[PDB]
Every structure is written in C-alpha cells, then in structure tokens.
Amino acid sequence: SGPRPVVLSGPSGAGKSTLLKRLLQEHSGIFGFSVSHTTRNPRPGEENGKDYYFVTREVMQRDIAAGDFIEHAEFSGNLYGTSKVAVQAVQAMNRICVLDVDLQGVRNIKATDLRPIYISVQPPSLHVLEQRLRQRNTETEESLVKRLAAAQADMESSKEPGLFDVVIINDSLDQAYAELKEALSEEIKKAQRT
Numbered sequence: 001s002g003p004r005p006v007v008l009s010g011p012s013g014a015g016k017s018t019l020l021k022r023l024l025q026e027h028s029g030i031f032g033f034s035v036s037h038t039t040r041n042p043r044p045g046e047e048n049g050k051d052y053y054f055v056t057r058e059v060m061q062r063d064i065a066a067g068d069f070i071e072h073a074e075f076s077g078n079l080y081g082t083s084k085v086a087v088q089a090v091q092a093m094n095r096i097c098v099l100d101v102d103l104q105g106v107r108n109i110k111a112t113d114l115r116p117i118y119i120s121v122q123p124p125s126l127h128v129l130e131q132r133l134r135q136r137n138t139e140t141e142e143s144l145v146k147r148l149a150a151a152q153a154d155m156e157s158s159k160e161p162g163l164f165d166v167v168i169i170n171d172s173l174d175q176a177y178a179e180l181k182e183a184l185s186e187e188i189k190k191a192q193r194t
Contacts, residue, residue, distance in 0.1 A: 002091035003187040005116035006031075006098045009106050010158070011151035013133045015170040016121035019177050020100060030191040032095040034086035037069070040078040053086065070112065071105050084112060094194050096187050103154050106163065119183060120164040122155055124171055 010016045024031055037053040039060050048054050055063075060079050064072055072081035082099070090097035099109065099116065106118060123129035129151055133139055139147065158167055166183040170176045181188070 001190075003030075003094065003096045003190045005087055005091065005114060006096055006184060006187070007106055007109055007116045007118045008098060008100050008121065009103060009118070009154070009164070010121040011123060011129060011154045012147060013136075014121050014123040014129055014151070015173060015176060017100065018173065019121060019168075019170075019180055020098060022173075022177055023180065024098075027188070030096055030188055031098050032090045032093070034082050034090055034097055034099075036086065037063075037081045037083055038078055039080075040076075053083070070099070070108055070114075071101060084114060087114060094191055096184070096191055103157050110163075117166070117184065117187065118164045119180065120154075120158045120167045121176065121180075122158055122167055122169055123151075124169055126152055126155070 008016050008020055035049060035051070035053055037055055037060060039055065039057040040052070042048070042052075042054045046052065046054075057079065060072075060081065063069060063083070064079075064081065068083050068085070069081040070084060070087065072079065074080075087097045087099070099105075101109070109116060109118075123132070126148065130144070130148060133144060133147065158164055166179070168176050168179045168183075
C-alpha cells in the first residue's frame with residue numbers, strides 16, 4: 001500500500017509552486033518532502049535522516065552511477081540528490097511525497113519504477129503568462145525572453161500523450177487549486193485513513 005507520489009510540473013510562473021504552497025499549508029500530515037542526500041559536512045544541530053542523508057562523496061558518486069537518484073545537482077561545492085528510497089520512505093509513512101521538478105526531471109521519474117501522478121499546471125496562454133510575469137515586477141526584458149521560451153517548451157511537451165495524468169489550466173488560483181485537490185482526492189483519502 002501507500003499513497004502514490006505526486007509529480008507537479010509546468011512553467012515556472014504558471015502557478016505550480018503557489019498551488020503547492022497552498023496545498024502544503026491547507027493539509028496537515030498528508031503531504032511531505034523527501035529527505036535529500038548531501039556530501040556536505042553535517043552542520044551542528046542537524047540529525048541524519050531528518051535534515052539530510054549525510055554521505056561521503058565516494059558513496060554519492062557510486063549511488064549516482066548506480067541510478068539510485070531521481071535528480072542530483074552540485075551546489076556550493078557539494079553534491080545533493082533525491083533518492084528513490086527517500087521518496088519511498090515518505091510513501092512508507094502514509095504520506096504523499098511531492099516532487100517539484102522540471103520537464104526533463106519528469107522524464108527521469110518516468111523511466112524509474114515509481115508510480116506517481118504526473119500533473120502539469122499550465123497557463124491559459126503564453127500571453128496570459130507574460131502578463132502575470134510583468135505584473136510581479138521581478139523580470140527584465142532579457143530574462144523575460146529566456147523564461148517565455150522555456151515556458152513555451154514546457155507547454156509543447158505537455159501535449160505529449162501519456163506524459164501527464166492531469167493538466168490544469170491556471171485560469172484562477174481558486175479553481176486551479178480546486179482541480180488539483182480533485183485530482184489527488186484518491187491519494188489524499190488514503191493518507192487520511194491510518
């Protein structure tokens with residue numbers, strides 16, 4: 001048994017992170033994040049298994065080459081990764097592990113033995129997404145063309161059949177969060193019964 005994981009994807013500004021933030025705040029003990037591996041020296045006050053899986057660089061490289069990691073990256077000179085076991089550990093605790101990855105990362109999980117629910121949170125159009133990105137007053141004209149192009153790539157790939165189980169169009173955050181809850185209603189019910 002165990003509640004299936006959730007892969008939430010889509011363009012950066014289309015609202016997949018906002019909806020996930022609201023989703024995590026309005027649910028108690030149903031959703032959770034994996035504990036990631038790192039090669040970093042354990043900082044004082046950190047416990048193994050709760051904050052990070054602190055492992056040696058040699059161990060990290062071996063487990064990367066063995067395909068144990070869904071995604072891995074370098075940061076501040078150390079290595080980090082999200083192992084399948086870390087995701088399966090959340091499923092073991094009757095919780096819904098939530099993975100917020102890019103389009104490529106969806107492909108990584110597709111090849112693995114996990115069986116999550118792939119959800120893409122798309123904007124109503126590229127024009128509506130451009131309007132929302134300008135309203136938040138964070139972008140420049142140079143970054144805007146990078147994000148729009150990357151967004152368009154994500155929207156095209158979302159049309160591939162069998163890729164995403166549910167595709168939510170972010171007309172409004174009220175309905176978009178409503179559709180996200182309805183998609184996960186079965187896995188939320190499973191986590192609510194212990």
